[PDB]
Amino acid sequence: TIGMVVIHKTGHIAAGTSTNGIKFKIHGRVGDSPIPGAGAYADDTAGAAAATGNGDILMRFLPSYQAVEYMRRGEDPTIACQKVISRIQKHFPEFFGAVICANVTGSYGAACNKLSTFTQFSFMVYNSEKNQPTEEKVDCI
Amino acid sequence: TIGMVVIHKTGHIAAGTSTNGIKFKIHGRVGDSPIPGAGAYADDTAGAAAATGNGDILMRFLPSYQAVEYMRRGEDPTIACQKVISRIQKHFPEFFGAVICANVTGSYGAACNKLSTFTQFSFMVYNSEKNQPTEEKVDCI
Amino acid sequence: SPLPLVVNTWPFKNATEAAWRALASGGSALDAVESGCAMCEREQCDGSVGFGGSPDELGETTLDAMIMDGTTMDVGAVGDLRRIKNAIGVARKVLEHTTHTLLVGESATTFAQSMGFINEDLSTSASQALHSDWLARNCQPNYWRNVIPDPSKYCGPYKPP
Amino acid sequence: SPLPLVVNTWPFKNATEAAWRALASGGSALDAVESGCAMCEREQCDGSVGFGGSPDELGETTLDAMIMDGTTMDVGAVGDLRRIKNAIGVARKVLEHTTHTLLVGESATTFAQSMGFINEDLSTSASQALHSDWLARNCQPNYWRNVIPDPSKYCGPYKPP
Ligand SMILES: *[C@@H]1O[C@H](CO)[C@@H](O[C@@H]2O[C@H](CO)[C@@H](O[C@@H]3O[C@H](CO)[C@@H](O)[C@H](O)[C@@H]3O)[C@H](O)[C@H]2NC(C)=O)[C@H](O)[C@H]1NC(C)=O
Numbered sequence: 001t002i003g004m005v006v007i008h009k010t011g012h013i014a015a016g017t018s019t020n021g022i023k024f025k026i027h028g029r030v031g032d033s034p035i036p037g038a039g040a041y042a043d044d045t046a047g048a049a050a051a052t053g054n055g056d057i058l059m060r061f062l063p064s065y066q067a068v069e070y071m072r073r074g075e076d077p078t079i080a081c082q083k084v085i086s087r088i089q090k091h092f093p094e095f096f097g098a099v100i101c102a103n104v105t106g107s108y109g110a111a112c113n114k115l116s117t118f119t120q121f122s123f124m125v126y127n128s129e130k131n132q133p134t135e136e137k138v139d140c141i
Numbered sequence: 142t143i144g145m146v147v148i149h150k151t152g153h154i155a156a157g158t159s160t161n162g163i164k165f166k167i168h169g170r171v172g173d174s175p176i177p178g179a180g181a182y183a184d185d186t187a188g189a190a191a192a193t194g195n196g197d198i199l200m201r202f203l204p205s206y207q208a209v210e211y212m213r214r215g216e217d218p219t220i221a222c223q224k225v226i227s228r229i230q231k232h233f234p235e236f237f238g239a240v241i242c243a244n245v246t247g248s249y250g251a252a253c254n255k256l257s258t259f260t261q262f263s264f265m266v267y268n269s270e271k272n273q274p275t276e277e278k279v280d281c282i
Numbered sequence: 283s284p285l286p287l288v289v290n291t292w293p294f295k296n297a298t299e300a301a302w303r304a305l306a307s308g309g310s311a312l313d314a315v316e317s318g319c320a321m322c323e324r325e326q327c328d329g330s331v332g333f334g335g336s337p338d339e340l341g342e343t344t345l346d347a348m349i350m351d352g353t354t355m356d357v358g359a360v361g362d363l364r365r366i367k368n369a370i371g372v373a374r375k376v377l378e379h380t381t382h383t384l385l386v387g388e389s390a391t392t393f394a395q396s397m398g399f400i401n402e403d404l405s406t407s408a409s410q411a412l413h414s415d416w417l418a419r420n421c422q423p424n425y426w427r428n429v430i431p432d433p434s435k436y437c438g439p440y441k442p443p
Numbered sequence: 444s445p446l447p448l449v450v451n452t453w454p455f456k457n458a459t460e461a462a463w464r465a466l467a468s469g470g471s472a473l474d475a476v477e478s479g480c481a482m483c484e485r486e487q488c489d490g491s492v493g494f495g496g497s498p499d500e501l502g503e504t505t506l507d508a509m510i511m512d513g514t515t516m517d518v519g520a521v522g523d524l525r526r527i528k529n530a531i532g533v534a535r536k537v538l539e540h541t542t543h544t545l546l547v548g549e550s551a552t553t554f555a556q557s558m559g560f561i562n563e564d565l566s567t568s569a570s571q572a573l574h575s576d577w578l579a580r581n582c583q584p585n586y587w588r589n590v591i592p593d594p595s596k597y598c599g600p601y602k603p604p
């Protein structure tokens with residue numbers, strides 16, 4: 001899955017995803033990617049977020065909408081993103097998931113649930129300061 | 142569309158919906174009903190909510206999830222439901238939609254968007270306090 | 283304030299009664315929600331639930347339903363379910379027999395048949411008329427936009443200009 | 444200013460690049476998102492995006508995609524898209540040419556064809572191979588539970604207990 005958040009220079013935000021799902025999914029299965037608020041969410045008044053991981057689970061917690069909701073109240077992108085991971089973590093401690101957050105001014109962050117097999121999450125960034133697609137990285141909590 | 146919320150005697154909560162969609166919808170269209178947080182949402186730690194109306198618009202604001210989110214914060218069921226309608230209202234003043242709310246202790250409420258053709262919303266309630274399902278109504282805001 | 287509590291959209295009293303009856307017999311909240319909603323699928327509540335209603339552009343009635351367990355926060359759902367009347371029944375089977383959350387279209391039908399559901403036409407003479415009257419009316423209303431011919435005047439096929 | 448900004452999941456740099464390029468050419472935020480995601484569909488990023496990957500139980504690759512406009516809060520989305528490669532391209536068309544949010548299955552394939560997309564098999568020798576080794580390992584892993592025969596040891600079809 002690929003989740004992407006883009007903030008135009010004007011301040012207009014857009015978000016999106018594309019995926020082929022999970023291997024050997026039951027015929028007709030649809031994950032979180034095409035679901036607004038789960039796979040991705042964008043609002044010019046707050047910010048945008050995109051999620052990736054086990055959509056069967058993420059879908060039930062609407063991670064992208066909640067991340068944007070936190071940012072709506074002034075929360076820092078990384079914090080809004082970690083808080084989202086923490087709530088799911090309370091229900092499914094072994095869930096595979098990563099979320100990227102960005103507020104209306106251009107600040108970004110990310111978070112992922114730490115598994116023995118998943119300890120760090122990389123994501124690409126590109127803005128004015130960085131004149132090259134910069135691969136960021138975060139340790140899972 | 143029918144959206145239903147039930148709180149078992151043991152405090153366990155469940156919610157669900159069923160619908161045939163909107164008349165003359167494009168072949169293959171899916172509304173808010175089967176989407177968690179949109180058509181319905183249930184959480185034993187917060188409460189539950191269910192929505193109905195124009196699913197195309199509703200699913201973009203995740204009404205059931207946000208209503209439950211407010212009650213999680215302490216909001217009275219009615220106020221949680223009203224706040225949800227307002228948020229959407231600012232984006233689509235003429236959208237058709239109604240939401241039912243209920244917190245963990247059995248308090249319920251509802252709200253709807255006021256239209257020339259829709260000024261009241263009727264919903265069924267069945268309490269132990271009542272010995273028959275009674276029809277409740279709320280004036281839309 | 284006292285429990286159990288059953289709340290549902292619209293004055294669909296029979297669904298309320300059906301859900302309450304399930305709880306009264308010892309059924310869980312999931313049993314209650316399923317019973318109440320299945321009642322409206324059968325009674326075709328307001329023609330906006332179950333078969334024989336809201337035909338799409340091709341005249342086919344497709345159902346959407348979901349059921350959520352508030353304890354585990356497990357969910358079972360189907361969208362664009364074709365040729366199966368008990369939509370919320372199939373949704374519950376998704377919850378109990380898979381680790382997935384949503385199954386759609388003709389693929390969900392196959393799944394439903396595997397779970398014991400009867401594959402049958404969802405049309406009725408009433409929904410067939412509604413569709414033909416709609417066609418005669420130049421397909422009004424519809425949800426297309428930015429296409430030709432003018433969707434506010436004509437039927438499709440449509441295409442971007 | 445720190446804007447414009449492009450952020451995407453995983454080390455998919457070519458997708459980030461296509462998105463930036465879209466912006467540089469005076470493209471909108473939406474144009475950028477579509478460009479970035481489509482780039483991974485062509486490239487089959489990690490085999491988790493685009494055709495020729497993640498075959499389902501039947502060996503078929505089906506795609507899901509979404510695009511959202513933060514300004515209007517309009518959303519175009521497709522789920523269980525069959526036989527169409529440019530999933531996010533189709534999702535954007537749902538946004539631009541209908542007032543609906545989500546279209547699914549073979550029905551969505553028909554919609555895509557109307558919008559000018561090419562109908563084609565999404566399988567490749569690689570994905571088939573992936574599927575065959577799966578059949579060989581007795582369909583392990585799978586997402587079924589509480590069915591007969593035991594999903595943890597055997598392949599399907601399954602029936603309720
Ligand atoms: C579920 O929703 C209901 C209705 O909003 C909540 O009930 C209200 O709870 C508050 C206590 O938090 C009650 O007000 C307090 O009432 C006592 C009465 O002795 C008074 O001493 C306090 O100064 C204050 O007024 C209020 O009466 C009660 N309302 C109703 C209609 O019952 C309930 O708390 C919610 N449950 C949860 C878990 O959030």
Ligand SMILES: *[C@@H]1O[C@H](CO)[C@@H](O)[C@H](O)[C@H]1NC(C)=O
Nearest residue numbers: 074075076077103104105107
């Ligand atoms: C965006 O994030 C930064 C870092 O937390 C914060 O200082 C800034 O005020 C945020 N912008 C808004 C509008 O909240």
Ligand SMILES: *[C@@H]1O[C@H](CO)[C@@H](O)[C@H](O)[C@H]1NC(C)=O
Nearest residue numbers: 293294295296297299325327
């Ligand atoms: C269910 O609803 C219809 C309309 O109110 C009514 O005619 C019917 O008798 C009700 N069901 C039963 C079992 O009475």
Ligand SMILES: *[C@@H]1O[C@H](CO)[C@@H](O)[C@H](O)[C@H]1NC(C)=O
Nearest residue numbers: 455456457458486487488489
């Ligand atoms: C872009 O990334 C892919 C991996 O997804 C790599 O194989 C390819 O060489 C890169 N594109 C170009 C034009 O070099």
